Each structure stands twice: as structure tokens, then as C-alpha cells.
mmCIF file of C-alpha atoms in Angstrom:
data_model
loop_
_atom_site.group_PDB
_atom_site.id
_atom_site.type_symbol
_atom_site.label_atom_id
_atom_site.label_comp_id
_atom_site.label_asym_id
_atom_site.label_seq_id
_atom_site.Cartn_x
_atom_site.Cartn_y
_atom_site.Cartn_z
ATOM 1 C CA UNK N 1 95.718 113.486 92.183
ATOM 2 C CA UNK N 2 93.165 114.743 94.840
ATOM 3 C CA UNK N 3 91.234 118.099 94.854
ATOM 4 C CA UNK N 4 90.272 119.620 97.906
ATOM 5 C CA UNK N 5 90.116 123.323 99.302
ATOM 6 C CA UNK N 6 91.060 122.465 102.729
ATOM 7 C CA UNK N 7 94.651 122.540 103.916
ATOM 8 C CA UNK N 8 94.758 118.991 105.296
ATOM 9 C CA UNK N 9 96.824 116.497 103.958
ATOM 10 C CA UNK N 10 95.987 113.276 102.104
ATOM 11 C CA UNK N 11 98.572 111.251 104.663
ATOM 12 C CA UNK N 12 96.322 112.072 107.884
ATOM 13 C CA UNK N 13 95.178 109.198 110.143
ATOM 14 C CA UNK N 14 91.510 109.444 108.176
ATOM 15 C CA UNK N 15 93.329 108.230 105.047
ATOM 16 C CA UNK N 16 95.048 105.696 104.162
ATOM 17 C CA UNK N 17 98.151 106.960 105.799
ATOM 18 C CA UNK N 18 100.682 105.532 103.259
ATOM 19 C CA UNK N 19 102.718 106.489 100.032
ATOM 20 C CA UNK N 20 104.306 110.104 99.609
ATOM 21 C CA UNK N 21 102.037 113.105 99.094
ATOM 22 C CA UNK N 22 102.756 116.648 98.425
ATOM 23 C CA UNK N 23 101.301 119.738 97.477
ATOM 24 C CA UNK N 24 101.109 120.309 93.690
ATOM 25 C CA UNK N 25 101.826 123.849 92.034
ATOM 26 C CA UNK N 26 100.208 125.087 88.654
ATOM 27 C CA UNK N 27 97.609 123.197 86.979
ATOM 28 C CA UNK N 28 98.021 119.616 85.431
ATOM 29 C CA UNK N 29 98.716 119.321 81.637
ATOM 30 C CA UNK N 30 98.729 115.845 79.894
ATOM 31 C CA UNK N 31 101.628 114.593 78.291
ATOM 32 C CA UNK N 32 101.590 115.825 74.489
ATOM 33 C CA UNK N 33 103.753 117.671 71.735
ATOM 34 C CA UNK N 34 103.356 121.031 71.483
ATOM 35 C CA UNK N 35 102.783 122.524 68.279
ATOM 36 C CA UNK N 36 102.756 118.804 66.482
ATOM 37 C CA UNK N 37 101.218 120.459 63.432
ATOM 38 C CA UNK N 38 102.176 124.053 63.439
ATOM 39 C CA UNK N 39 98.750 125.277 64.175
ATOM 40 C CA UNK N 40 100.090 128.326 66.004
ATOM 41 C CA UNK N 41 102.270 130.596 64.152
ATOM 42 C CA UNK N 42 105.351 132.011 65.840
ATOM 43 C CA UNK N 43 105.042 129.166 68.285
ATOM 44 C CA UNK N 44 108.187 127.442 69.208
ATOM 45 C CA UNK N 45 108.180 123.617 69.873
ATOM 46 C CA UNK N 46 108.292 122.825 73.222
ATOM 47 C CA UNK N 47 109.928 119.833 74.991
ATOM 48 C CA UNK N 48 107.716 118.690 77.755
ATOM 49 C CA UNK N 49 108.777 115.689 80.443
ATOM 50 C CA UNK N 50 106.649 113.347 82.639
ATOM 51 C CA UNK N 51 106.314 115.814 85.973
ATOM 52 C CA UNK N 52 108.454 118.391 84.617
ATOM 53 C CA UNK N 53 107.436 121.984 85.565
ATOM 54 C CA UNK N 54 109.212 124.999 83.960
ATOM 55 C CA UNK G 1 62.551 73.503 110.695
ATOM 56 C CA UNK G 2 63.306 69.903 110.654
ATOM 57 C CA UNK G 3 61.500 69.904 107.446
ATOM 58 C CA UNK G 4 63.642 72.944 106.119
ATOM 59 C CA UNK G 5 66.600 71.488 106.892
ATOM 60 C CA UNK G 6 65.739 68.017 105.641
ATOM 61 C CA UNK G 7 65.428 69.440 102.076
ATOM 62 C CA UNK G 8 69.281 70.371 102.848
ATOM 63 C CA UNK G 9 70.028 66.951 104.308
ATOM 64 C CA UNK G 10 73.876 67.680 103.200
ATOM 65 C CA UNK G 11 75.210 68.866 106.686
ATOM 66 C CA UNK G 12 78.992 67.584 106.228
ATOM 67 C CA UNK G 13 80.912 70.446 106.199
ATOM 68 C CA UNK G 14 79.650 72.383 109.096
ATOM 69 C CA UNK G 15 76.773 74.673 108.454
ATOM 70 C CA UNK G 16 76.355 75.450 104.848
ATOM 71 C CA UNK G 17 73.349 77.896 105.458
ATOM 72 C CA UNK G 18 71.428 78.887 102.548
ATOM 73 C CA UNK G 19 69.023 81.276 104.248
ATOM 74 C CA UNK G 20 68.935 85.017 103.848
ATOM 75 C CA UNK G 21 70.223 86.384 107.387
ATOM 76 C CA UNK G 22 68.455 89.628 106.577
ATOM 77 C CA UNK G 23 68.890 90.805 110.227
ATOM 78 C CA UNK G 24 71.906 93.377 111.605
ATOM 79 C CA UNK G 25 71.215 95.725 114.145
ATOM 80 C CA UNK G 26 74.108 98.378 114.333
ATOM 81 C CA UNK G 27 77.515 98.880 113.944
ATOM 82 C CA UNK G 28 80.426 100.979 112.005
ATOM 83 C CA UNK G 29 81.509 97.677 110.584
ATOM 84 C CA UNK G 30 79.743 95.728 108.229
ATOM 85 C CA UNK G 31 77.329 97.394 105.849
ATOM 86 C CA UNK G 32 74.327 96.702 103.771
ATOM 87 C CA UNK G 33 74.120 97.609 100.114
ATOM 88 C CA UNK G 34 75.358 101.219 100.971
ATOM 89 C CA UNK G 35 78.903 99.875 101.403
ATOM 90 C CA UNK G 36 80.083 102.184 98.210
ATOM 91 C CA UNK G 37 78.268 105.393 99.519
ATOM 92 C CA UNK G 38 79.795 104.925 102.974
ATOM 93 C CA UNK G 39 83.035 104.320 101.755
ATOM 94 C CA UNK G 40 83.348 107.571 99.589
ATOM 95 C CA UNK G 41 81.827 109.770 102.560
ATOM 96 C CA UNK G 42 84.575 108.569 104.892
ATOM 97 C CA UNK G 43 87.286 108.745 102.412
ATOM 98 C CA UNK G 44 86.741 111.803 100.641
ATOM 99 C CA UNK G 45 83.561 113.695 102.009
ATOM 100 C CA UNK G 46 84.929 114.459 105.305
ATOM 101 C CA UNK G 47 88.539 112.397 105.408
ATOM 102 C CA UNK G 48 90.147 113.766 102.446
ATOM 103 C CA UNK G 49 88.311 116.465 100.119
ATOM 104 C CA UNK G 50 87.087 118.972 102.368
ATOM 105 C CA UNK G 51 83.877 121.215 101.489
ATOM 106 C CA UNK G 52 84.216 122.810 98.005
ATOM 107 C CA UNK G 53 86.442 120.040 96.542
#
């Protein structure tokens, strides 16, 4: 993952120009079990998958 | 120079120079100890990560 305010794709001639690069949506969340300890009351336990957005 | 290379005296596999070669004029290729800095200039500063990254 690369952070940049310019609307320039990383696959340009200046970069390596290899691999598949696509624009991302939303923030990045590390894989973890939500509400494992039941710390937050009234919070349903969510199922999170890798690269899964919902 | 004869005395210096006499200290080596082991010229069998080409040169095997033991000097320093502290000379370089100009190029966009080979670099001095600033290799790490110049790479992250070209890869990030103006190539991939635009201003405000």
C-alpha cells in the first residue's frame, strides 16, 4: 500500500511498471476479531475477512 | 608504482586491484554513499508519492 495525494498511478513509467495496482476505498483495518472480550456492550460480533469490505 | 605493485606481486587473475578508486566525474547511474537517498527521491518523492504524501 502506498500513500499519495497525487492522482498518479504507481504503475507509471517512473515506477517499476509491474504488478496489479488499483485505487483503494476507505481506510485500512488490520485483521482482528471484533468484540473478542465483549468490551463494547450492545455490539454484535462482526466477521471480518482479508481484503473484505462491507 | 613498481614498488606498490611489487607488494601485491600476485597478478594472476587479471588486476585484483587493492586501491581506493576515489574518483567519479558525473552520471545518473553509479552513485556514492547517497544510493539510499537518491533511490527514495526517484521512487517516492517525485515518481510515486506526490506532494503531500
